[PDB]
Subunit: 387 residues, 4 copies
């Protein structure tokens, strides 16, 4: 029988050292590998092309996503970059979501201005906006679900089938939920990618990406382009990332416990105008998220009553929510997308996406529920004292 | 509120970098630190004496245990060696447990044979044996609870009060439960120590130790001795250990779920003569463990029916229990104490400990309970097929 | 005075830690950095965009090359990729050397097939071939000198001036000599780039790249593109790379001592048909290399008498020259460019470059001259025994 | 031929990976190694006992010193502690030098006060003081040559023969010259040890120690005791240390060049009362150093004219000599032994060592000789301006 996803993450590279029988995999930093006499390349030759420590992480994320293999890039942006270079050429069109990560928006828009591809920026949750984008015969559709930072939910089965009907490949950015909470390849997607910086690593001490292809042929094309462009990651970073992955299933139980308790505090608290969290029955996308996700996750964002003064008072004095970029760490974080995560967007693209100036995003960590709730209650008082 | 234990473990070193505001603490590998001009030592001078990355792990273990300070050593045995050198000299007597870790037994017996101290090896679970050791006016009593590998429960209240009445210091090896599950200092111990190699690091990729003193002055004596003897550990190892500590709570919730289910399978199974697990109501010590511990942990051992042939058949074919030394890893492990963890002991001292040639010890990981039970049931069949 | 290049390399990041006064710089792995309250970005925010450990290496290479700043990429190919994306768009033409690194050939040819730019492949050492390339109004000319693997020398001042006259930017791949042996920006080049994998790191345990721009504005454009494409390097790799740089000047004295003694053995030895080494007065490019370089380096290639049988016998039995890819490490290496480093080129592109099926390339390390010479003499005998 | 010292250091662990043929050795962090089925220990079982990455550094130091084996410890002081515990018991006498490292003095005086052994502190450069110590039938003599920080030269032939005639073991602290410049085991010492923190690592980013025994049985005793006491170091530190070792020869060529130039400046400069540097023909011990060493090294100390005010003015404004502890780094360093390296000693034991309150010690780096002399001349002016 096969093991579960949780077993496979915990045991990736365990007892797989033929040299010494090390239980925990050795770090192979070596740039280079000997040939076995003249003309006899071993399995590995050069670390930019292939490295065994990085391949343990690739093979582990491929097992977790149900793919034919994985490529580990220096950054998550690099994983998106790898997919655009492998799949697209001038004259091909790309469809992307309106409310994707601001750095995704930045790369799509910079590479389209150069004419590497034509860009259609669409709302993939509105059937009309989708059908108009697919009727332009795109080579590639990118889905980001749940979306950063408003947690809009796109219907994987629906969009993937509609993309296949017009001959488009699909790629899903699965960063916000990780493989442990969403498996886009199960619904027929061709590619899934991550910022490993987030949950997969879990300790905010690695920036990395991953791409997993369903098909062996498309995996080989990603290996070729990652080598030729020089986008592959450092073995040290793969080592820490693999170490991280071993606690992903354990981390996520505590994250989701904390996130449910915090959603219940923020939803119809008098100082809170709107919570965006797919776990609330009132959230547009809740029933989709409960169907295509194994849990509702631990990212959420919210709008305070009381304009900019309430935001400043809420944020200044948080002891357990560090005001910082990134997400998916064991440590709780808060960000202000307008000035931080989505500062790379124009004011116009933020307004089209529906990211206000008052929006705060929480990355809820694995600290004790009680300490996070006290911290958030004190912020809600500092905000109220602003009226 | 100060924070909970889980919050303190998650947040140790977080947002505590004055140079750049790094969220996650920088690794300070440097052997040396500049003076602030002639005659002005800064806080740090030299890594053997004091290092800030090491001191983040020291401070976090002191906070979790309730102590004045911590000293991080290169190994767990190094921690035991630090306490013996800081506290004892020739003419002092040390009391230790009969069923301690065999590497502990090896060090106690080697240093006693040199004349560094006189040794009394006693059953600290039995009032009689304890009172006969305390009648000899020891300088120091060492407690290991629960004990490796039979999980005997020493009564902390009882043994620490009786030792204080004869003027003895107490030290507890708290390796097997970690600070998250037992706090010997709350019972009045002078010292608690750990192999951080186990649950504190949690990833089987560091060997380390720590000692936490209740009292500031004994903490300064340990700092002095660790520096003089050169027993302090590496900043890189401290970074990995602090990183592992952040998931200690999350890991222990899965370790304990999995161990409660495996105990249920082995207790009363036709192929199991004996199970040693403090969480079983029929383990002597259950009621004690329920009151001095916050959980029953995830270490257990057991004796199969069917002699040597049953042991060999059980062990050959385990897929998810790696036959290896150590414990407290995310990865499940099995050991044969007689030929592995306790081979450092004489056949005689093992018989006095009541560690038999058939004993198997499990360190239960954080893999899916379903996989670990399928693996153990197939082992129990393979052993049954032996009769 | 400023210090010398050697002083600056040895002391890059020495005594620059404001937290503790650490003599050697801390490793800042953190993905993220706190804000200093709401709206107050610190100097660093996110490691893909900027990280202080990577910036020490950036700043050190910029100081060594005489530039406004340095960007550190995951790989050397990545550094080339960063320059092609920052500088070129469809319709711009690029001029590259005919005998550049085969991975450079692969990337140029793959992005030109996609139409990211038009490609002119020229012999930059032949005036006619250059003037015909420059008469086509290119946006960018890339020079690789000395060339891999034939050590062809291109006249930096000549080519850079001819490029400035038609409005072209120049970029020089300075991997083969490092900043310590050639400074292309001194001759007016706009950009210099390296595989830090080679001499700068020096220890074959990092794959990395660097790009240094003369002008502050072009440096800012590289920071922008490196962030948006996600091409930035791991801080751990920057740490090891900086540690490596500290011995570059010391390593290169022994490399060049060993290379001079090996060129003298190989040149007009009866089994050696041709040596390509810029230190020989007979080498096309010697007087140029003596003018525009501070030494002749430690890369060289050679052609044995006796066809494929002589190659196979020379290579099989080398004790001190490991048959592997890469170069610039303290360990001596040998490669066969046709089947290894230049296997990415078509047979047609190799023949146009003048890379035969018989060519061997040596990366001469810092072992004792005597042991390397014995190893090479025994290889020359095994080669002679095949006639 | 076997290879030279330089070749052995460069090539230690090169091409010695059976799993992938990694050129540079993998980092084996694992605490634990699997058994090959029930009852079959592999070569490695547990990192505290034995680790292959650590053993590559042990084996390379043994090869360089001509011994049977090496044991790598967490610190240099840990190496001294290992030897004291493996060899001595109460009733034994140890002879140590009057002018040893102050941390050595602290350990000897602390463990003698406990009664672990009787201590004789003697001037081993003076025949009379030596013979009076040897007339007491010591179990062990420790030599430190050259001595920290006055560079006194002990006669290895003389002291080791005199100690063998009374049945005493000898151990030499070879920290100050490294195996590349002195080999105590060629003179018949039983043991040689190092702070690997200094020249062997060479990059001021590891604290470590090593002990090499001439005889295979004493090496086995050191392995046993290091294991039992838990003094063994971290695999990560061994990896960095072996990495630094590879440039030991190249670094020492520059260190020695720079040190000969600085000795030339300080010897008979009008502001310099005394220089202690074995390479000066007038240093007592010159002729001995010339015969028993392969170079005079790069440690020196000196006494300025002009009392405390001259010291303070010399030290304030040094740009290239960091005021800090340690030595043997690529970075130049300056220490005040009385307030820094030797503050662990009493004013009396310093007076007996003849370490005055005016003494400054230089660790000369591999920066440009021209820069280090500009820095020192400006320091000498600043001190002159004081009269
Ligand atoms: C959904 C999604 N996909 C990709 C990524 C990529 P990676 O590893 O950081 O490269 C992310 C990352 N999101 C992050 C990173 C914010 S950093 C923005 C500031 C920086 N100064 C910049 O210019 O980029 C987030 O939403 O916090 C994501 O949410
Ligand atoms: C209760 C307890 N205290 C201390 C330690 C110390 P450390 O980090 O390994 O130094 C332990 C470790 N127990 C471990 C490690 C045992 S491995 C013994 C084999 C080795 N060949 C040897 O000779 O030592 C265990 O019981 O698995 C412990 O259980
Ligand atoms: C001159 C030059 N510029 C750039 C680089 C780039 P980097 O760090 O490896 O990414 C190099 C590297 N040269 C190297 C690397 C050869 S690895 C070839 C095999 C590999 N299987 C592949 O497909 O690429 C060399 O010439 O040895 C160079 O010589
Ligand atoms: C000759 C010699 N033997 C051993 C050592 C051992 P290790 O790696 O530091 O443990 C040394 C070290 N010399 C170093 C020691 C750094 S001084 C540290 C002062 C510190 N606050 C303390 O109390 O110890 C030196 O002389 O600079 C040596 O010179």
């Amino acid at each position: 029988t096969p093991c579960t996803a949780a077993t496979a993450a915990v045991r990736a590279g365990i007892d797989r050292d033929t040299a010494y029988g090390a239980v925990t995999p050795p770090i192979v930093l070596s740039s280079n590998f000997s040939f076995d006499g003249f003309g006899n390349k071993r399995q590995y030759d050069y670390t930019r092309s292939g490295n065994p420590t990085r391949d343990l992480l690739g093979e582990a994320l491929a097992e977790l996503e149900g793919g034919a293999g994985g490529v580990i890039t220096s950054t998550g942006m690099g994983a998106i970059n790898l997919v655009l270079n492998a799949v697209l050429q001038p004259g091909d069109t790309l469809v992307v979501p309106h409310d994707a990560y601001g750095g995704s928006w930045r790369l799509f828009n910079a590479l389209a201005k150069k004419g590497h591809f034509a860009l259609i920026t669409a709302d993939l949750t509105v059937p009309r906006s989708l059908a108009d984008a697919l009727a332009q015969s795109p080579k590639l559709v990118l889905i980001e679900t749940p979306s950063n930072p408003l947690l809009r939910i796109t219907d994987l089965r629906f969009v993937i089938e509609a993309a296949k009907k017009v001959g488009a490949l699909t790629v899903v950015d699965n960063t916000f939920l990780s493989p442990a909470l969403q498996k886009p390849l199960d619904f027929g997607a061709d590619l899934v990618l991550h910022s490993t910086t987030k949950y997969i690593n879990g300790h905010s001490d690695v920036v990395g990406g991953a791409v997993v292809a369903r098909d062996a042929e498309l995996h080989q094309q990603l290996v070729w382009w990652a080598n030729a462009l020089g986008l592959t990651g450092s073995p040290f970073d793969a080592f820490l990332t693999l170490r991280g992955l071993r606690t992903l299933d354990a981390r996520l139980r505590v994250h989701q416990e904390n996130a449910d308790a915090i959603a219940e505090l923020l939803d119809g608290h008098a100082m809170v105008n709107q919570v965006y969290f797919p776990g609330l029955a009132t959230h547009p996308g809740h029933a989709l998220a409960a169907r295509q996700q194994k849990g509702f996750g631990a990212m959420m964002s919210f709008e305070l009553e009381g304009g900019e003064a309430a935001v400043r008072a809420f944020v200044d004095g948080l002891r357990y929510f560090t005001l910082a970029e990134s997400l998916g760490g064991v440590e709780s974080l808060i960000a202000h997308p307008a000035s931080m995560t989505h500062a790379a967007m124009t004011a116009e693209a933020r307004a089209a996406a529906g990211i206000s100036d008052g929006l705060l995003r929480l990355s809820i960590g694995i600290e004790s529920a009680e300490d996070l709730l006290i911290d958030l209650r004190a912020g809600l008082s500092r905000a109220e004292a602003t009226l």
